[PDB]
A paper describes a structure:
Of the novel s2a and s2b structures, that of s2b was solved at higher resolution and therefore is described in the most detail. Similar to holo s2a, the two NCS-related holo s2b structures are virtually identical (r.m.s.d. of 0.4 Å). Each holo s2b structure begins at residue 766 and the last residue is 860. The first bulge occurs when Pro784 breaks β-strand A and pushes the subsequent Lys785 outwards, which in turn leads to an approximately 127° angle between β-strands A and A′ that also changes the allegiance of β-strand A′ to β-strand G. The second conserved bulge is introduced by Lys798 and Gly799. Temperature factors for both NCS-related structures are low (the average B factor for molecule A is 11.7 Å2 and that for molecule B is 9.9 Å2). Anisotropic B-factor analyses using the Anisotropic Network Model (ANM) web server showed that the main chain is mostly isotropic and that potential correlated movement occurs exclusively at the N-terminal linker. In s2b, the insertion of Asp819 results in the region adopting an ω-loop (i→i + 10). In s2b, Ca2+ chelation by Asn774 and Lys775 could stabilize a 310-helix (residues 770–774) that aligns with the cylinder axis. Meanwhile, the N-terminal linker structure of a PKD-like domain is described for the first time in the holo s2b structure and suggests that Ca2+ repositions the linker along the barrel axis. Of the three domains, s2b is the most stable.
Clostridium histolyticum collagenases ColG and ColH are segmental enzymes that are thought to be activated by Ca2+-triggered domain reorientation to cause extensive tissue destruction. The collagenases consist of a collagenase module (s1), a variable number of polycystic kidney disease-like (PKD-like) domains (s2a and s2b in ColH and s2 in ColG) and a variable number of collagen-binding domains (s3 in ColH and s3a and s3b in ColG). The X-ray crystal structures of Ca2+-bound holo s2a (space group C2), Ca2+-free apo s2a (space group P61), Ca2+-bound holo s2b (space group P21) and two new forms of N-terminally truncated wild-type apo s2 (space groups P21 and P212121) are reported for the first time. Comparison of crystal structures of ColG s2 with crystal structures of ColH s2a and s2b suggests that despite common tertiary folds, PKD-like domains can be grouped into two subsets.
Numbering used by the authors: 766 to 860
The structure:
Amino acid sequence: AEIKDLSENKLPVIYMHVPKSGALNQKVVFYGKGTYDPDGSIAGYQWDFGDGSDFSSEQNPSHVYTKKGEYTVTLRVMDSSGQMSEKTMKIKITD
Ligand SMILES: [Ca+2]
């Protein structure tokens, strides 16, 4: 069998569940569950909560937003070949 080039790698497919709404000062949970690599495995997650907080490396992070507003959440995922996909969602924080 010939060695297959890295350019043939299939990228990770992101499943990202961010609720449309959350409440000020209350824990919300986001889910990356189901994210998969069609020809390998998932090697890492990176969530940006959109509020200046440290990013999370968790699959399914909890977070508290401490001001009302709309936040863009970005999830980047790396597969077992070191290659990446990204998705975004918006959450609106109200009282
Ligand atoms: Ca792959």
